[PDB]
Swiss-Prot record, chain A:
GO cellular component: cytosolic large ribosomal subunit
Pfam family, one: Ribosomal_L2_C
Subunit note: Part of the 50S ribosomal subunit. Forms a bridge to the 30S subunit in the 70S ribosome. Interacts weakly with protein L37Ae.
InterPro entries hit by this protein: NA-bd_OB-fold, Rib_uL2_dom2, Ribosomal_uL2, Ribosomal_uL2_arc_euk, Ribosomal_uL2_C, Ribosomal_uL2_CS, Ribosomal_uL2_dom3, Ribosomal_uL2_RNA-bd_dom
PANTHER family: LARGE RIBOSOMAL SUBUNIT PROTEIN UL2, RIBOSOMAL PROTEIN L2
Protein name listed in UniProt: Large ribosomal subunit protein uL2
Keyword annotations of the record: Ribonucleoprotein, Ribosomal protein, RNA-binding, rRNA-binding
Organism: Haloarcula marismortui (strain ATCC 43049 / DSM 3752 / JCM 8966 / VKM B-1809)
Family annotation (Gene3D superfamilies): 2.30.30.30, Nucleic acid-binding proteins (2.40.50.140), Ribosomal protein L2, domain 3 (4.10.950.10)
Similarity comment: Belongs to the universal ribosomal protein uL2 family.
Taxonomy of the source species: Archaea, Methanobacteriati, Methanobacteriota, Stenosarchaea group, Halobacteria
Swiss-Prot record, chain B:
InterPro entries assigned to the protein according to its UniProt record, in alphabetical order: Ribosomal_eL44, Ribosomal_LSU_eL42, Ribosomal_zn-bd
Cofactor annotation remark: Binds 1 zinc ion per subunit.
GO terms, molecular function: large ribosomal subunit rRNA binding; structural constituent of ribosome; tRNA binding; zinc ion binding
Cellular component annotations (GO), alphabetically ordered: ribonucleoprotein complex; ribosome
Organism of provenance: Haloarcula marismortui (strain ATCC 43049 / DSM 3752 / JCM 8966 / VKM B-1809)
Domain of life: Archaea
Gene that encodes it: rpl44e
One Pfam family linked to the record: Ribosomal_L44
ZnF (C4-type) ranges: 11-74
Protein name: Large ribosomal subunit protein eL42
Gene3D superfamilies given in the database record: 3.10.450.80
Family: Belongs to the eukaryotic ribosomal protein eL42 family.
Positions bound to Zn(2+): 11, 14, 71, 74
Keyword terms of this UniProt record: Metal-binding, Ribonucleoprotein, Ribosomal protein, RNA-binding, rRNA-binding, tRNA-binding, Zinc, Zinc-finger
Job description of the protein: Binds to the 23S rRNA. Binds deacetylated tRNA in the E site; when the tRNA binds a stretch of 7 amino acids are displaced to allow binding.
Curated annotation (Swiss-Prot), chain C:
UniProt xrefs under PROSITE patterns: RIBOSOMAL_L37E (PS01077)
Keywords: Metal-binding, Ribonucleoprotein, Ribosomal protein, RNA-binding, rRNA-binding, Zinc, Zinc-finger
A GO molecular-function descriptor: structural constituent of ribosome
Organism this protein belongs to: Haloarcula marismortui (strain ATCC 43049 / DSM 3752 / JCM 8966 / VKM B-1809) (Halobacterium marismortui)
PANTHER family associated with the record: 60S RIBOSOMAL PROTEIN L37 (PTHR10768), RIBOSOMAL PROTEIN L37 (PTHR10768:SF0)
Protein name: Large ribosomal subunit protein eL37
Amino acid sequence: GRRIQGQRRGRGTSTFRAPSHRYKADLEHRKVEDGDVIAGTVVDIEHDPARSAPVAAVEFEDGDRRLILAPEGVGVGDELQVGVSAEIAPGNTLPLAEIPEGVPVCNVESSPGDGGKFARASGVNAQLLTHDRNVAVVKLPSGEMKRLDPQCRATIGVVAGGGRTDKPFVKAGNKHHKMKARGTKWPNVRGVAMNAVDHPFGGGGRQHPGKPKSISRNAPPGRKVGDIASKRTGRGG
Amino acid sequence: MQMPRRFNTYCPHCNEHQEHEVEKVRSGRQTGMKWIDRQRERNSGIGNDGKFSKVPGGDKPTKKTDLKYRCGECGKAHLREGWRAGRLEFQE
Amino acid sequence: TGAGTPSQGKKNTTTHTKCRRCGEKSYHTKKKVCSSCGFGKSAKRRDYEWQSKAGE
Amino acid sequence: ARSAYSYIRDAWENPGDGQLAELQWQRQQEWRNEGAVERIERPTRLDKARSQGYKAKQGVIVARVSVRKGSARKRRHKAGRRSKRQGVTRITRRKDIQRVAEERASRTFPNLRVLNSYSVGQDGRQKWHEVILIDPNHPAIQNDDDLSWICADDQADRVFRGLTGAGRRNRGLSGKGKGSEKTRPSLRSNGGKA
RNA sequence: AAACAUCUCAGUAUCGGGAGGAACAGAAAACGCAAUGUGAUGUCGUUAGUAACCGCGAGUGAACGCGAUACAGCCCAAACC
RNA sequence: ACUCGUACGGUCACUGAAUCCUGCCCAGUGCAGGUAUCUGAACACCUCGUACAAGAGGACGAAGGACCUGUCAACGGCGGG
RNA sequence: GCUUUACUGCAGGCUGUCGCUGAGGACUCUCACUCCGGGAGGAGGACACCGAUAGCCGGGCA
Ligand SMILES: [Cl-]
Ligand SMILES: [Cl-]
Ligand SMILES: [Cl-]
Ligand SMILES: [Cl-]
Ligand SMILES: [K+]
Ligand SMILES: [Mg+2]
Ligand SMILES: [Mg+2]
Ligand SMILES: [Mg+2]
Ligand SMILES: [Mg+2]
Ligand SMILES: [Mg+2]
Ligand SMILES: [Mg+2]
Ligand SMILES: [Mg+2]
Ligand SMILES: [Mg+2]
Ligand SMILES: [Mg+2]
Ligand SMILES: [Mg+2]
Ligand SMILES: [Mg+2]
Ligand SMILES: [Mg+2]
Ligand SMILES: [Mg+2]
Ligand SMILES: [Mg+2]
Ligand SMILES: [Mg+2]
Ligand SMILES: [Mg+2]
Ligand SMILES: [Mg+2]
Ligand code: NA
Ligand code: NA
Ligand code: NA
Ligand code: NA
Ligand code: NA
Ligand code: NA
Ligand code: NA
Ligand code: NA
Ligand SMILES: [Sr+2]
Ligand SMILES: [Sr+2]
Ligand SMILES: [Sr+2]
Ligand SMILES: [Sr+2]
Ligand SMILES: [Sr+2]
Ligand SMILES: [Sr+2]
Ligand SMILES: [Sr+2]
Ligand SMILES: [Sr+2]
Ligand SMILES: [Sr+2]
Ligand SMILES: [Sr+2]
Ligand SMILES: [Sr+2]
Ligand SMILES: [Sr+2]
Ligand SMILES: [Sr+2]
Ligand SMILES: [Sr+2]
Ligand SMILES: [Sr+2]
Ligand SMILES: [Sr+2]
């Protein structure tokens, strides 16, 4: 047949690319030698095209102006700190080791110094649970217990923009506008609605997959469609 | 059908009638060193392998008698044509 | 709109132009590659054995 | 008595044992951080180089080249093929890696000509070979009674036509009798069945 | 191959790289008319549709030798300096 | 490529606004989990065979399968007496 | 052209084995190799990646 859409994506053609030239900036934590004597002042609050959430422009002591992954409750004028000694308040960044247990955190690093990998989406947050000299246990937004290096840096508080998902798009035109700001091909044509040549579920008098949807993990690209290696399906049980 | 285990008949070796013992031919084990074996390895590779990609044919409803006839005095055996027989059980 | 006559009216783009290297009107001014001699694509001259009968 | 050279030689018969083993473990670390073709002032295997024609003289260059280990890097047929011509994985190329190496080296030094080459080891993902190249335009060489032959016009780009030692071996030209019916005088002249 | 998959068409078409006036080969770790014999290498005639291969099907297919053409043999590495 | 993205994410699919609802079936097929025992290739190992080798057999045994479980808003099914 | 539990194969994924590959049926270590870090250094580690092969699945493709 013909390659399915999932395969067209990989080529990374314009239709499937993110409007990168239009994106503002990479929100990775600042790099500090040591000391924590790094403080800056929130100079402005801005909209981040890539995440549909606000971001804060900060001016640091040494003269470095950079956008930051802002938590809820940060405003112009406020002073932020980043370092091992940094104060324990919303908007500040410091290694988990220095963070008191039971404190909601965001933009958590996977590997100390990477700049932040976890909990960066609208109104989300990780929960620092256990401390140690060898392992900092964090509970991620998905509910998973992650064992991390206490040396991994993070930002106190939850990410700004919470609740974004609570309101419906109501109309296609709204989805449209959001989708245009992402690396995504939209709208979506169902497999069952295409010709046999275009998808494993195409063909047939009436629409219906002529096969079970739960596909094996070992399925090759082009065949791995439907419910991938589902451990189960439905709502029952 | 029934079949005597031993009986008097012609032994093409002694060139005279003598008692013989009848036995079903047991299949001899292969060595894997015959020419055909070397051709299979030589000619089998990527893709289809011609004749070496075919598989065991079918079966006939009844098979023919497959027997050995052993002379009771010279110890040598001879073969005879077989005849279709659903079953062949020896008497004694 | 028909793909024939009506769609021919929209054709006013310039693509193939006289090539600096070979003189043919085959220099694609947008790709900056000559479809005839290969200028802009290769230092060597564009050639192929299929441009003639096999035994000739 | 034994030459000093013989010792270098004897060490390389078992590059996995003795001091050489430790030298390779060290070197390869550096090599892995070098380019595809690195020119070097002195052959790693002096005996072999000299034996192949090397000389400490002007116009004689030596370069180490690394190449990816394994079989062919082939693309599956996009058009219809009979099972026979559908293979993709276990298919290997017809030139050995040493030959690929000699050619890359010669491309890096367009004006030089491949004299010979030899192996200097490998790890699990690549192989290294050192190549001796000669400057056919340098008078120090145009006058050498042992190398001026490589200055002739017909020796130009010799490596690209299989005129190398590795070239000739890989073309099945070793044997002078049985088995070379389709290799001599050339693969092409024999319809390409060798 | 009266289908077709091994095989065939064929190492052909076509593609990448490269030299010359011609290229390539070439002075035996050869041959093995087994010899008290031949003596670098091309090529031409023959050996021969022979040996060999092959759903042992269709088809594919040499070599040594011999008669010719032309002939030509040498240089390193190491030992010792 | 997705991605200056990180589960309030984005990938793969089904249904197709709101409203009131969405029953029964895990035997077969699919996916997934488990698995005492069974079955399960090659390398290495052992025995026989060969002054070697081909080869035969053995021991061990991964995923997989047998077997068990979960799962239908998974493919689908919901009859005759 | 299309389909599939048609025939035969081919990609691809899973899995064992050999090489990469080191020291003291379960274990420690560091030195290759990998990843994080501007750097120091940190994490991992003879695994993983990669080459080879073997078994399984395999209309995704011929
Ligand atoms: Cl969305
Ligand atoms: Cl019988
Ligand atoms: Cl060259
Ligand atoms: Cl002779
Ligand atoms: K064919
Ligand atoms: Mg960022
Ligand atoms: Mg768009
Ligand atoms: Mg749709
Ligand atoms: Mg339709
Ligand atoms: Mg399809
Ligand atoms: Mg439907
Ligand atoms: Mg001399
Ligand atoms: Mg010729
Ligand atoms: Mg035919
Ligand atoms: Mg062939
Ligand atoms: Mg036939
Ligand atoms: Mg042929
Ligand atoms: Mg011969
Ligand atoms: Mg519908
Ligand atoms: Mg509809
Ligand atoms: Mg990196
Ligand atoms: Mg097909
Ligand atoms: Na063969
Ligand atoms: Na060159
Ligand atoms: Na025909
Ligand atoms: Na036909
Ligand atoms: Na055949
Ligand atoms: Na004679
Ligand atoms: Na069921
Ligand atoms: Na058609
Ligand atoms: Sr980043
Ligand atoms: Sr970065
Ligand atoms: Sr369908
Ligand atoms: Sr239910
Ligand atoms: Sr073969
Ligand atoms: Sr095969
Ligand atoms: Sr039958
Ligand atoms: Sr229209
Ligand atoms: Sr019109
Ligand atoms: Sr126009
Ligand atoms: Sr170009
Ligand atoms: Sr050309
Ligand atoms: Sr040239
Ligand atoms: Sr002569
Ligand atoms: Sr509805
Ligand atoms: Sr089931």
